[PDB]
């Protein structure tokens, strides 16, 4: 039954792992490492207040006292657990082993962190018009700029090289039901531009069994989820660019 306790929650755990580490290969490797640790000694799984919490607790317990905090500071981890992973504060506090007041401190520091981040320029690739309008207004109300919305591949290629977006928000599926993921990668080629992918079924891209995206925003959209994922993506990109400029 232990498997039946853990199996359902592994897809979203990979999402958190990817959001914390900044890549699929790294994020998935941590989750696989957790399974290796459970294979080695099953009794490390905790009796938390829920299976899901137990799973995230274990994850953070094994890899955060490369430590997770080195990759993403605990403050930002705290905001991710609420804004992206959908825990409430009591639950995320338990995951991070903090009293609710101390958790709230982390949240506040994260809010500070994100507000000090320079706003970015987003290109949206979305064919469903109501969806694209939603994500545009949400992105702008979060303080970023939308450089434009492309409906087709040809539109996106042109928009990308002319408007030079610093971040792409893309649907995993385009008009002809063809892959939005392939389309974005065909456009960027070797470019290191953060992409966040929109899907109604994120779990289907969180198997860790094939190439899958680093960032996934769930539709219907939540402003805090978008805020968190854009913030993480910009942070990793900044640190990569800072490191490459050295």
UniProtKB/TrEMBL annotation:
GO biological process, one term: phosphorelay signal transduction system
Species this protein is from: Bartonella quintana (strain Toulouse) (Rochalimaea quintana)
4-aspartylphosphate: modified positions: 171
Keywords (A to Z) from UniProt: Phosphoprotein
Response regulatory domain ranges (all copies): 121-234
InterPro entries with a match to the protein in the record: Bact_response_regulator, CheY-like_superfamily, PhyR_sigma2, PhyR_sigma4, RNA_pol_sigma_r3/r4-like, Sig_resp-reg_PhyR, Sig_transdc_resp-reg_receiver
Protein name per the record: Sensory transduction regulatory protein
Membrane as UniProt keyword: no
Keyword Phosphoprotein: yes
């Amino acid at each position: 039954s232990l498997s039946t306790r853990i199996a359902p929650h592994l897809p979203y755990l990979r999402r958190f792992a990817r959001s914390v580490t900044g890549s699929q290969s790294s994020g998935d490797a941590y989750v696989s490492a957790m399974l290796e640790a459970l294979i080695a000694d099953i009794s490390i799984f905790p009796r938390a207040s829920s299976d899901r919490i137990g799973t995230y607790w274990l994850f953070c317990h094994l890899f955060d006292q490369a430590k997770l905090s080195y990759l993403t500071p605990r403050a930002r981890q705290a905001f991710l657990l609420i804004a992206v992973e959908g825990f409430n504060e009591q639950e995320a506090s338990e995951i991070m082993n903090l009293d609710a007041r101390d958790f709230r401190k982390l949240l506040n520091q994260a809010s500070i962190d994100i507000s000090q981040q320079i706003a970015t320029q987003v290109m949206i690739i979305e064919d469903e018009p109501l969806i694209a309008m939603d994500i545009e207004q949400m992105v702008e109300s979060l303080g970023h700029q939308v450089v434009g919305i492309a409906r087709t591949r040809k539109e996106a290629v042109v928009m990308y090289h002319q408007k030079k977006p610093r971040l792409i928000l893309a649907d995993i599926q385009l008009a002809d039901n063809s892959s939005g993921i392939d389309a974005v990668n065909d456009i960027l080629q070797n470019d290191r531009i953060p992409v966040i992918f929109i899907t109604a079924f994120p779990e289907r891209l969180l198997t860790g069994e094939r190439p899958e995206p680093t960032f996934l925003v769930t539709k219907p959209f939540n402003p805090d989820m978008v805020k968190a994922l854009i913030s993480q993506a910009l942070f990793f990109k900044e640190n990569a660019s800072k490191a490459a400029l050295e």
